[PDB]
Amino acid sequence: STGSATTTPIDSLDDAYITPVQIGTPAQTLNLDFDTGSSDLWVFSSETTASEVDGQTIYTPSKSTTAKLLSGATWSISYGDGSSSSGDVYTDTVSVGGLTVTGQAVESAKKVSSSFTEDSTIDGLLGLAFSTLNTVSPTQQKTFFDNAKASLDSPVFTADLGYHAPGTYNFGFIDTTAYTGSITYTAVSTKQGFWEWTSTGYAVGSGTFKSTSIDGIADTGTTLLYLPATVVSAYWAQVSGAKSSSSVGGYVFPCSATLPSFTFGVGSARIVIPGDYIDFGPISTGSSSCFGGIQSSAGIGINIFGDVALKAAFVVFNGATTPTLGFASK
Numbered sequence: 001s002t003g004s005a006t007t008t009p010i011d012s013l014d015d016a017y018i019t020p021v022q023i024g025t026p027a028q029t030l031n032l033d034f035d036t037g038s039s040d041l042w043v044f045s046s047e048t049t050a051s052e053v054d055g056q057t058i059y060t061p062s063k064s065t066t067a068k069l070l071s072g073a074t075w076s077i078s079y080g081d082g083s084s085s086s087g088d089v090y091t092d093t094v095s096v097g098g099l100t101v102t103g104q105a106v107e108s109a110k111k112v113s114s115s116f117t118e119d120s121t122i123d124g125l126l127g128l129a130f131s132t133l134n135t136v137s138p139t140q141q142k143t144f145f146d147n148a149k150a151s152l153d154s155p156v157f158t159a160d161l162g163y164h165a166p167g168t169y170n171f172g173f174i175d176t177t178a179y180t181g182s183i184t185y186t187a188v189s190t191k192q193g194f195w196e197w198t199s200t201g202y203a204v205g206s207g208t209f210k211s212t213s214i215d216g217i218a219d220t221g222t223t224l225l226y227l228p229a230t231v232v233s234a235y236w237a238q239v240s241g242a243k244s245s246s247s248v249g250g251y252v253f254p255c256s257a258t259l260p261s262f263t264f265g266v267g268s269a270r271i272v273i274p275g276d277y278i279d280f281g282p283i284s285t286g287s288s289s290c291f292g293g294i295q296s297s298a299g300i301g302i303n304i305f306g307d308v309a310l311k312a313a314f315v316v317f318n319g320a321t322t323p324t325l326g327f328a329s330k
């Protein structure tokens, strides 16, 4: 089997991407944030505290003839931005772009933090990291990918995120028309439950490539690119007027600037992030100070190749017995 679904930026800054997902019988279609940095499939639901729902589409298990309460199972997640959610668990039929999994754990939110409530466009998350990070207790549950894997033509999914445009998540096959050149594969460590890999270095604009190992995770659920302070300083040093602002919480730059590209290494290959991808617009409405798309990971404990980086590439998440990551230009 295979599946193919279009993923769409939620706003004009590509803050996140939503992908339609069919849950239950008859289908209830929710727009989920596919997140390769977490491993829970959780949704706004009929059980969510009413005051904590603000425009989201909800999953109503009682209207699904295939939904079954997973007795005694609860979940609770606290992401790395203070946001959180928790609730109970059903198993139900879940389909993505024509690919169907029966008995998928669907985590129904009883509570969500304000940061999720405010995102009216995101009806939940579909985690695509390793199932070892799944928060369901007392019996940990598998991701959609993990459940689908054996049935797939090939045990892979790919992320093809667009810049200010729709893109594609494919399951079970590589679309060889969706990228240029070849795919460079690189080793993955699953020890932290992430798609964790090591970049071979970077360049700023037309500058010389610096060979240096940078460990990090491929995370479709993070907006920006978080890298070591040395790397980030080197980048923003090339932008007149750029500075790290403690009050804003990162590097800012004059909105009138044209940004340099940023290149990262994948083995001997190179992925170029165009400068425009690194512009996340005014810090507040009407401001001429703009927020940078490359930020320091110093306060995080891990480097994160989020959407800023990933949308510059065609990315293969290879779930073979020994997982690997593939990157191609596009």
Ligand SMILES: CC[C@](C)(CN)N1CCOCC1
Pocket: 015, 016, 081, 083, 115, 116, 118, 119
């Ligand atoms: C998780 C909440 C958060 C960070 C903030 N409301 N969203 C912002 C929009 O893009 C998805 C993530």
Ligand SMILES: CC[C@](C)(CN)N1CCOCC1
Pocket: 013, 015, 223, 224, 280, 281, 282, 283, 284, 290, 291
């Ligand atoms: C991801 C960047 C983010 C959170 C997008 N809403 N902002 C931060 C503040 O300056 C403008 C950009």
